[PDB]
Chain length 275, copies 3
Amino acid sequence: AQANEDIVVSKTSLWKEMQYNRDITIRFKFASSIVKSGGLGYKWSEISFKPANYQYTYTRDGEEVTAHTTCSVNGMNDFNFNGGSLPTDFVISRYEVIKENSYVYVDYWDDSQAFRNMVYVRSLAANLNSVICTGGDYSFALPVGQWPVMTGGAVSLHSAGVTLSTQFTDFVSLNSLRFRFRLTVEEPSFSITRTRVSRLYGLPAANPNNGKEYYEVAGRFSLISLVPSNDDYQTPITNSVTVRQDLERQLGELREEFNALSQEIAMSQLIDLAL
Amino acid sequence: AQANEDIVVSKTSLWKEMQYNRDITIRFKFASSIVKSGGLGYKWSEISFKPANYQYTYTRDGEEVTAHTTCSVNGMNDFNFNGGSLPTDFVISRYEVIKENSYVYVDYWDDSQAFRNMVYVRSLAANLNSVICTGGDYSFALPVGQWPVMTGGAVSLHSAGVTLSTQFTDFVSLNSLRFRFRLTVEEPSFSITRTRVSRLYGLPAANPNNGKEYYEVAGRFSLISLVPSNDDYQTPITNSVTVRQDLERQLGELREEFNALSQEIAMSQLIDLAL
Amino acid sequence: AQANEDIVVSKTSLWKEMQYNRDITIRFKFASSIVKSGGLGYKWSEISFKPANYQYTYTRDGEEVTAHTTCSVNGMNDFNFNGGSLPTDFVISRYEVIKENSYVYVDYWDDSQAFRNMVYVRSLAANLNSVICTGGDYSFALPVGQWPVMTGGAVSLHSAGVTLSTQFTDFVSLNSLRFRFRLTVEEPSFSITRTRVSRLYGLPAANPNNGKEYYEVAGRFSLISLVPSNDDYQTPITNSVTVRQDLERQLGELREEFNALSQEIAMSQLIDLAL
């Protein structure tokens, strides 16, 4: 049997149960959200994860296959480090770490025949190989003084159950395959340099990629889906999203008031610099 | 005939028409969005509603059924109250109130068989019982002076038409059932203490829940859906959302601007503290 | 024959293949996002496009049909204009323009039968006529100085391929038809007045509607869709979205910090009015 088979286990007039058994190259990537509190610059608000899309195009056995992957994390632990109540001590209100109790979700999609009209799926199963995700080096750019660097962190992702999901984005909506990963803490630990914290396992949520373009893991998946017998039917993929108009309005009002305040401030500095 | 039946009104080679007639306990909940303008703290920008999720797990007749509800409002009336044009007068540029002209929407979903692959439905109907919803007690936190409190408001929710809908979220996407509700004013009227306004009907948007963990209304729904005869197919439920990336970018630019302005202000405040 | 046909090209127990061929009135609309940087008010951070919803109701040949149209743009170029490094020169960090290399997407939907349970489509085609899109006059509200006005700009929208799409919103979710448009620059150019920029082509992202209520283009489409033979099945349309809760949380922290800073500024300014 080919590595990229496609078989029919039942076929009525309009519908047909098509089996698919195919190899895949999941190339995903974390993405971090860094919110820094105001004042001088010595207090950071959040260092968390954001679901991250990554579209690529790889080579199958004489075919070019475009893909779309989306990495997310669930059940992460919220740590924090506060060394003083004054505006000049380095503090991080809340930063996220990954351990055993957390999980790493990866939605995957391709331009192949398996994902063209997939809305129903049974007999789902996959053979995935394990990889090692290592964190990088994030230099907290303080206004003045020293520059602590959050450096280190290694954690091994192991295959787990598989499910379905939907990758929503501002361009495409994809009925996609959801691969789960569990975590086993590894030897390289992450530590904030020039600080009283070190030798704690996990992965940091500042620079997980470690300056990499992606994390690669190869796999195979096997399912049975409902596809119309005619191989010309198409399910809507693209999107045109206008969600959270109330949020857009809130942001517009905030920008208006912020421009008014900055105007008032620079006017106070202009009158105080017009002698 | 049972209360939670499951019938097969037809069956083809792959698909099947199934009828589902089931009892439900809609435990829903509102959620308010408050926005406080800058300046001193006597001026409020908006007090509105937001679509509010609530997931839970209730006992059926010997089954534990996990449920998921999402409330929302439409056609609400935007009242205002301005005591003057000064920084020190209490003013609320806009706050939302629920009345007869408006409608309340409640999306409902469960982990039962009626919802697993529900994409098509007909003969939809439900017999819901009416309830009462009373407003809360929201104490406007003013910087200095007395503390006005929005207190009162009671409206009875009457059952109306039933339809389908979709509960999108950052975790799950659900093909759900949409109960509609109309409103009738009641005797308890809402009013702001220490203010020249009172004896006006409706339900405030500051605290509708009245501190209740949820509002509860029982119901029953009967319908007929198209499901695959093989009860192993699964429709995609989970999500990994990255919608409004342009909005994320705008928020990042606004954070950068506000951090730079706060750093400027803090430096200008600290230069005067070196004597 | 008919202009609004509905044919049955095949039929089985529960499903069927229907062919719909209908005339339509695509009344779409552009929308701009004008972000103004802080400071004094001479510096503009960005002027971009945003996907624009517009819903209406128009008269077919004795039928009154409700419709919904969502415009978007893709591949738009980013131009910039800096007059100096000072706070007092009129600078536009970025404004978006449309040209040949770019494309305009229009997702279209009606309440007619062709869209009631459309999830699968084949033999999709369309005949569209060309229209003209022209820019208005966006006067930049400079606090002091002259008044630059971005004016002009005209482009011819020529039809292109048709596909499927999904219009998502905070209210409705529509499995819609995606008409694509390619562009050819016209003679009327866009120019900012009292400024050293003119005789450059494209469409300004400032006021693309030209003060109009919509841009109307007639059309006709033909397709072949899979529908339940029982013409009573309904697919979920309405929504209740709670997406980007983390973004809402970041915006709320931003608002709290901004209110605290504004309170500090206002107390600092009020303490100097006690004589």
